Design a protein around this ligand. Sequence first.
Ligand code: 11N
Ligand code: 11N
Ligand code: 11N
Ligand code: 11N
Lengths: 242, 242, 242, 242
Amino acid sequence: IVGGQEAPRSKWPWQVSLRVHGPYWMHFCGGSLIHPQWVLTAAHCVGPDVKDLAALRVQLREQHLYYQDQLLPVSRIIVHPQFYTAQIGADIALLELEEPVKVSSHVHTVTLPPASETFPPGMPCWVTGWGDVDNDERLPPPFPLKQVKVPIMENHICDAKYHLGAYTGDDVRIVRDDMLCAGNTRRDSCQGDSGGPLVCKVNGTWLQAGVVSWGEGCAQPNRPGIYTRVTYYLDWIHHYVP
Amino acid sequence: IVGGQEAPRSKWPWQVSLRVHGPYWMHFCGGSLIHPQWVLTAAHCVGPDVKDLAALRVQLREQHLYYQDQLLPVSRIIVHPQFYTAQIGADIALLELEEPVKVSSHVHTVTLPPASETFPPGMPCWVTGWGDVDNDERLPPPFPLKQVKVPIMENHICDAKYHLGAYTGDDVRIVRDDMLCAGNTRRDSCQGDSGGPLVCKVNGTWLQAGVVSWGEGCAQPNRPGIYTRVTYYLDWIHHYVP
Amino acid sequence: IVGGQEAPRSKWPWQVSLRVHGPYWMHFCGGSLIHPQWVLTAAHCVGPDVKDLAALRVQLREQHLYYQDQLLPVSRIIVHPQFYTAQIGADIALLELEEPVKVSSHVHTVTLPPASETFPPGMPCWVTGWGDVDNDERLPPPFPLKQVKVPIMENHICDAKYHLGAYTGDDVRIVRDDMLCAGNTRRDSCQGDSGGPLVCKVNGTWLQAGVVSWGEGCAQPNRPGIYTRVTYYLDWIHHYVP
Amino acid sequence: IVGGQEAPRSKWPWQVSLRVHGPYWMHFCGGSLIHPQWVLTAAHCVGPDVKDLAALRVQLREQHLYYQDQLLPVSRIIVHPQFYTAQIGADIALLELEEPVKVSSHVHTVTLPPASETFPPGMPCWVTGWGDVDNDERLPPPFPLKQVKVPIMENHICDAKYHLGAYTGDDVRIVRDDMLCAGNTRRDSCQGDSGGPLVCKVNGTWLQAGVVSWGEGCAQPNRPGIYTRVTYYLDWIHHYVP
Ligand SMILES: NCc1ccc2c(c1)C1(CCN(C(=O)/C=C/c3ccccc3)CC1)CO2
Ligand SMILES: NCc1ccc2c(c1)C1(CCN(C(=O)/C=C/c3ccccc3)CC1)CO2
Ligand SMILES: NCc1ccc2c(c1)C1(CCN(C(=O)/C=C/c3ccccc3)CC1)CO2
Ligand SMILES: NCc1ccc2c(c1)C1(CCN(C(=O)/C=C/c3ccccc3)CC1)CO2
């Protein structure tokens, strides 16, 4: 997370960390609990290449990475069949936990938005995660969960911004309709935040508008952060999550 | 270049080296001389972000990189407007030399293929370059130009192979019509070969079938090297090159 | 620490962590509390180049590095004036805390040996710290404090060990009089443990026999770890420490 | 070499490059031909750990490393028995080539100094090699041999410099009598130059005053380069070299 601050311990009860087996169970991507037995994340964290379930674990909401891990096994990984790269799109995936979660006050699911919610500029949104605090700059121990308020922008503007300082024809789409843009040169998501959630407080309810996906660097001019647009994939999510 | 051997001094008089300004004029990509004043390379080598012509130079065929540099300024960098990533396609670009080359003894142009050439499996094809000799293994000094003979694989077969061991739907095209596949687990191009030529001897003449574009690693099982198919962009090339 | 295991919470109340300013107050060396206002460490941790005191902090015993830091400022650095390198000798230094420490129960001082003490061969002593777990292998987060039991090796025997497979003349002393050997190919201190204590239980009491100083690698054949011999420097220590 | 320039092709005919077996025969240290069959280098290049002769080769003067290699096998490695670290001293060694050289015009031994030659300040002196061009900044391809004129500094004056900004006692000698100092913040040797020749022109003749040994960084304030003083080791050299 670029800019922003360490999260209070009562906020973002839906945030998860994905761990890969190695010299230790290392954080590699974020995710969000959207159902007591299901985690929403980005496909580029787990695909397009199929990997071994046994080597993956999920850690639930934790103020400091690694401090008091309670790692959870995954029974299923479900990656959107349309996914190949983040720029092409469909950067979304689901993890079915071996067992449902004992939902607490410290840990619970985030609400998915109605298909109608567009998240227009002006909505108050936050992105959270344990990723780099800037380009090539790791989150320092003891790895607190971070949050940053980010401005949302309409897709046509974000797409046009990406063509500034680039060879790509203005008529050639860069930011697709299944994506959503947010951030500026001081507030952004970054490497390690991938898969994590962008949430917006709508009518008193925090809704997950997006999934940290990609961008050119972090907090770079005319290169806002790009998220997978959750509303686009409600149909797909509902094939699997009750 | 993975596999193969150091090139004879007489072979591949069209191979060029692209250099970027820094501590030294460092090789970052290959290219081919297709006109005394024009160099053909890959788009991802010089984009999609717009670069300054001053930090760029071109070096014509050398047996050993850096050892007899006569660097050449470039007056125009022309990048295919459809390009954004190598997976999406249109990974091709043109460099106009500030001044025409005088066709030397070890410096000639490569012939572009007629639109009729599909380059079926079984044809004799070489890729050349000064890139990595394997995944994350640099070409050792004194940096001899390498060549390797690579088996051509039909697009549809190559596309289906890229799906092997991936989540990506059989529905979804990975290797596109503007691309071409060649290489196996012992013969391939790699990082630093990008922008370089793939050449096939057809009826007594060497034609440039492809431009080194991308792939999943180098020389990996079921992941042959991917090239920009030159016949697909003849029109665009001819729009600029006499 | 090479080999051994995580230290129980009750043990080694004198162990401290030396921190350098930067992106975060990063641990670079160990040490020991020998008095409520004084920490014993290695000269090479804080020399021979004179350091900025404002860039230094001390952290009393912690089960896990970084989680719950309570960093203490330092008012004086005192480096033995004979120190230039660890191979030459005199690898010992003192840090004066700006304020006396409130001695606790899980933070006590360690007892220094009487002027005569020898610590005979074979005798089992303990070295502790947050250092690397092997050659080029960092202690994984959450960075638990490690301990390991290491056998003392008599100096002359150790010195000969250091001559095996070396050009250095037998009559040239490599392990010196102000040094002490301990460890084997399975149990040793390592980078990051430097400045930390080697302790022995003598007649029911833990005495600090040495300070982690140096060695040829960690736990390599014929190269036990070298510690600075505390008894050699008792007089110097007592000139500053009440 | 820090500062200075590429050497003319006719100069320093005695310069040699030491190579170790790897992906390629990589340069790791310098040295000088002091006899058709003998190379003088630093001990820290080859010791104090005993090394396999079949893993080492010598390259006689080349304008550019690796470019036109003719590697020469070594029959004996002779490391001064007193060597253990460069700061301690006796950083000198001798390599016996498997066979004598065919002393041409491009290759020619350098002359050793008479015992009484002291090399006082003001004397004209150059150091040459293929080492780093600055701290942590490698010599760029195509790796030309560099040269630089270095100011000689009296041991006692040099010693004083080394005490500035250091905790080391004034009475503790850092720069020993078997060492010689030269260079400043613009001109100095550096990593990879070690073992190579420091030559001074005395009464029209070039004499090798020093062997590149060590220093605190390269070209740092108050830290001249330190060399083994050749005069000091004449007797030991002559016990082996006719
Ligand atoms: N702040 C949004 C964001 C969040 C998480 C995250 C990133 C960006 C990455 C930053 C670094 N990366 C790039 O720079 C990609 C360059 C690129 C060049 C050309 C065409 C497309 C893309 C890959 C994405 C790594 O993880
Ligand atoms: N042998 C063909 C080839 C030639 C030159 C060259 C390469 C491959 C690169 C190898 C390393 N790279 C990857 O591994 C890309 C992985 C990838 C994963 C998922 C979807 C798309 C792509 C990027 C391409 C670097 O330059
Ligand atoms: N277990 C003992 C020990 C404890 C802590 C610690 C070390 C060793 C270091 C290990 C790596 N280093 C070396 O290998 C030194 C090689 C050397 C070569 C030639 C002459 C003398 C020495 C430097 C010391 C780093 O910190
Ligand atoms: N220009 C002189 C010179 C020539 C060749 C060469 C060097 C210096 C090295 C530079 C880096 N090094 C150090 O910084 C040593 C630090 C040190 C700290 C404390 C006490 C003694 C020493 C090791 C020597 C590498 O090879």
